[PDB]
């Protein structure tokens with residue numbers, strides 16, 4: 106058991122969307138309690154929850170109401186579960202699975218009415234109101250504050266008002282929301298605008314701030330006449346139908362490469378700058394910082410990787426678009442939370458040129474190569490053994506080490522999502538086996554220190570890493586070898 110415990114990978118479960126409604130009311134504590142108690146008995150280590158900005162700071166600037174969430178955290182603590190708190194600076198409602206509508210603060214939306222450019226904008230000019238464009242990160246246009254200061258003040262307020270829960274070790278990590286669905290990405294595949302899998306998506310850098318940023322950048326590059334992509338097609342196009350993504354297309358020209366570098370760099374800096382504020386806000390707290398990276402697996406199997414590119418991940422067969430993110434996270438001692446841990450290529454339609462298995466291997470490998478912790482989540486609801494086995498495989502790519510800790514292991518997996526369906530007899534029985542196998546056949550272990558997941562005070566961010574150094578991580582590397590199947594299947 107001893108050596109097996111060092112192979113233990115913690116399992117968390119996402120709480121239902123809207124547990125705290127838009128009116129900032131913890132609607133059904135009794136119902137939730139019964140569910141959490143079932144998770145506790147099942148061996149689950151903790152749960153994850155969105156701490157919605159649009160709910161908390163709804164009244165106005167710096168008018169936070171943490172009461173309902175304090176009641177939620179209190180219940181979670183009573184149920185013997187830890188918590189992964191997401192600083193959700195995005196809207197719930199327009200992405201897959203969003204069954205509740207929670208917009209960002211109305212007072213922010215009011216400003217957006219006078220300044221439509223605070224929203225990510227596509228070439229056609231459609232404004233996406235689910236998140237504030239990186240373009241206004243440092244624009245003091247929100248009643249004197251910049252978007253990043255809003256995020257900073259929010260996290261500081263969270264840290265002080267939840268000081269008791271933090272001190273007791275209830276919160277294991279702060280998932281810093283960095284864009285749509287809390288992920289560090291552009292809203293390139295908006296269901297709200299008609300996008301449907303596996304559309305290549307669209308670049309979202311047309312708001313006046315980003316556009317001006319781009320124009321200034323190209324001018325300094327000696328090409329002031331360069332314009333943003335105008336041949337990348339539309340949301341539901343396929344790569345070959347566009348002049349930008351077709352073979353020998355614009356994406357490989359000097360202009361295209363410059364744009365893609367600029368576009369993706371905006372995300373790297375966005376995450377770096379906001380994480381700077383997160384390290385400040387939670388300095389000294391016994392919690393770890395983490396960010397979420399979306400798994401854009403469609404088109405991964407074609408040389409243009411169109412969907413990843415429009416999403417802001419400049420990843421190609423000869424350019425690693427994720428390792429730079431991992432390197433950026435290292436200075437913050439932050440965790441890279443990646444999705445698609447449950448997917449297998451065979452489950453995707455052939456016309457999508459989907460490579461979730463390879464993508465996961467690349468991202469996790471890059472994280473470990475950069476010596477950072479990598480965690481993850483299943484992208485879509487799954488209750489089957491096939492899904493759990495794939496997650497367990499990714500959790501320990503080279504299996505269990507009976508002689509000690511595994512060389513490779515994810516830092517944790519958060520399951521989407523707690524629901525009535527999950528708790529049904531058969532589904533829950535399979536889930537319990539999933540938890541057991543993730544735990545390397547060991548019983549639930551209340552003290553993380555036992556499996557080398559000790560919680561220590563968050564330290565200050567290490568020195569800033571120059572963009573040039575961050576981009577050195579674009580150098581392609583071989584992924585770590587993966588077993589074809591886990592050695593710890595939920596069944597046989």
Ligand SMILES: OC[C@H]1O[C@H](O[C@H]2[C@H](O)[C@@H](O)[C@H](O)O[C@@H]2CO)[C@H](O)[C@@H](O)[C@@H]1O
Nearest residue numbers: 155197200201202286287444483484485
């Ligand atoms: O509650 C967490 C977030 O869940 C959804 O976003 C998921 C998305 O469903 C999944 O496919 C992807 O892999 O991860 C994201 C983030 O966990 C909601 O759409 C978000 O609003 C929530 O914050």
Ligand SMILES: OC[C@H]1O[C@H](O)[C@H](O)[C@@H](O)[C@@H]1O
Nearest residue numbers: 200201294302400402484485
């Ligand atoms: O809506 C976005 C989702 O579209 C599809 O379901 C993809 O399979 C999934 O990976 C992605 O997150």
